[PDB]
Amino acid sequence: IESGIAHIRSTFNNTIVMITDTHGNALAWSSAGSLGFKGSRKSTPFAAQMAAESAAKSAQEHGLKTLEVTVKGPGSGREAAIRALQAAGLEVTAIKDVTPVPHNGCRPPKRRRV
RNA sequence: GACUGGAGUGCAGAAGAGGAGAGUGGAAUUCCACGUGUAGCGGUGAAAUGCGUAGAUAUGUGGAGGAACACCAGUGGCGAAGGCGACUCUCUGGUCUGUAACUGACGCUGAGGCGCGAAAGCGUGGGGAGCAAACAGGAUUAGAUACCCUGGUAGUCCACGCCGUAAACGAUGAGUGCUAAGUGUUAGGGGGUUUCCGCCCCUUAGUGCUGCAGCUAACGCAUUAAGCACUCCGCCUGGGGAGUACGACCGCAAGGUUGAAACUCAAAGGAAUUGACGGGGGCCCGCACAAGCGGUGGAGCAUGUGGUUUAAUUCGAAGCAACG
Ligand SMILES: [K+]
Numbered sequence: 001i002e003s004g005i006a007h008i009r010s011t012f013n014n015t016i017v018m019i020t021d022t023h024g025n026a027l028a029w030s031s032a033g034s035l036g037f038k039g040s041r042k043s044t045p046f047a048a049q050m051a052a053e054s055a056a057k058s059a060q061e062h063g064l065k066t067l068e069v070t071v072k073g074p075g076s077g078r079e080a081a082i083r084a085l086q087a088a089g090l091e092v093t094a095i096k097d098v099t100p101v102p103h104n105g106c107r108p109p110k111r112r113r114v
Numbered sequence: 115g116a117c118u119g120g121a122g123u124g125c126a127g128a129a130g131a132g133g134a135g136a137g138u139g140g141a142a143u144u145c146c147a148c149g150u151g152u153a154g155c156g157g158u159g160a161a162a163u164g165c166g167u168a169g170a171u172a173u174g175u176g177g178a179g180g181a182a183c184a185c186c187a188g189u190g191g192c193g194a195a196g197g198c199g200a201c202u203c204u205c206u207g208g209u210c211u212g213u214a215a216c217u218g219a220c221g222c223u224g225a226g227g228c229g230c231g232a233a234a235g236c237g238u239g240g241g242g243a244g245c246a247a248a249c250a251g252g253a254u255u256a257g258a259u260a261c262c263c264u265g266g267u268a269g270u271c272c273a274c275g276c277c278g279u280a281a282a283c284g285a286u287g288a289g290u291g292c293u294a295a296g297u298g299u300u301a302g303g304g305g306g307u308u309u310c311c312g313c314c315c316c317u318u319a320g321u322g323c324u325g326c327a328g329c330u331a332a333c334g335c336a337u338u339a340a341g342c343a344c345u346c347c348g349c350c351u352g353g354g355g356a357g358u359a360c361g362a363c364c365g366c367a368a369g370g371u372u373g374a375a376a377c378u379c380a381a382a383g384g385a386a387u388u389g390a391c392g393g394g395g396g397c398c399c400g401c402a403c404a405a406g407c408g409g410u411g412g413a414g415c416a417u418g419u420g421g422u423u424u425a426a427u428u429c430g431a432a433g434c435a436a437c438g
């Protein structure tokens with residue numbers, strides 16, 4: 001009711017933004033597809049902003065003033081999404097990383113055009 | 115017979131992902147269960163196949179399973195090479211530095227043999243999370259038995275045993291000595307100075323950069339020589355056929371090692387130079403685009419050209435650069 005955590009999964013294809021409680025129960029989420037986009041336009045900072053805003057202004061169901069934000073992936077829309085979450089009318093307390101880095105564990109798939 | 119600069123042992127130190135075994139750690143991919151949780155996720159140049167209201171995607175908790183080990187990590191270390199990176203222990207190999215104690219040429223190479231030997235692959239039995247040949251579906255395309263997407267078996271991992279190939283490459287055989295420098299870097303030693311620290315110089319074995327002589331067809335090599343010399347081995351004698359055929363040996367097999375001729379060609383090739391080109395880069399320009407104006411292509415006619423039909427339909431011009 002007072003504070004939440006935001007998880008953004010930004011990738012070179014789409015941006016998901018989920019607002020949850022600090023001990024990890026979902027209240028809301030959104031993405032560019034639920035926002036109404038269909039192609040590469042999903043992958044844009046504008047879609048990132050819009051999905052962020054929809055997420056936060058539904059998170060004001062049970063209400064909050066403060067967010068801790070956690071950013072995942074190489075998607076370029078993290079700046080726009082964080083600006084959205086600051087400017088929607090919430091006090092983003094801190095930003096942090098969820099870069100899922102293995103210490104050379106399981107290997108990636110192949111490069112493209114090979 | 116004698117000696118020690120080679121070679122080796124001893125003695126005092128130093129580094130190290132050198133190898134085998136056993137055990138061990140946490141990231142992190144996947145999966146199982148459970149909450150929260152609502153309609154998308156994924157992917158592309160666009161998509162679609164596919165997963166998803168029988169509830170995902172995500173988010174947290176806990177658990178299972180295997181594979182590889184970020185930072186350190188560096189033209190840095192070690193190793194004969196292949197290659198070796200998480201940690202600890204055990205068992206082991208080799209290298210360098212200093213000494214001049216010890217032996218006293220005991221050495222260098224090395225046909226034929228013996229072993230090792232990336233990855234793929236083969237046999238048996240496990241394991242199999244990811245990635246993934248083959249394959250299926252979806253796109254692409256003129257077609258696509260491909261690139262591209264979603265899935266995915268062999269495999270990849272282990273034990274044991276085979277296979278013994280490689281752009282297995284520094285495309286540069288092992289050994290010895292000699293022939294200018296400058297500079298990093300690693301492991302050591304010696305000395306001058308200084309409170310150690312720190313700076314400096316000399317030297318040993320490595321590893322890299324740049325360069326003198328000299329060599330080289332040149333590119334370039336240059337005390338880590340492709341220099342100057344000696345020993346030993348292996349290999350070459352135009353291209354292709356052909357690393358084929360016969361033969362032998364090895365191999366469960368796949369296939370490997372050894373290795374020709376007939377026939378055919380008049381070249382094949384290396385390095386470098388000048389251009390031209392480039393679905394390479396960079397800089398600059400032109401109505402070249404873009405921004406705009408008005409037009410052609412549509413209609414009718416004039417003209418020219420083509421094709422044709424003609425006794426003849428004179429000849430010439432033919433992408434830009436022929437066709438009022
Ligand atoms: K096997």
Ligand SMILES: [K+]
Nearest residue numbers: 196232282283
């Ligand atoms: K190699």
Ligand SMILES: [Mg+2]
Nearest residue numbers: 233234235270
């Ligand atoms: Mg193998």
Ligand SMILES: [Mg+2]
Nearest residue numbers: 403404405406
């Ligand atoms: Mg224009």
Ligand SMILES: [Mg+2]
Nearest residue numbers: 410411412413
């Ligand atoms: Mg007209």
Ligand SMILES: [Mg+2]
Nearest residue numbers: 419429430431
């Ligand atoms: Mg004419």
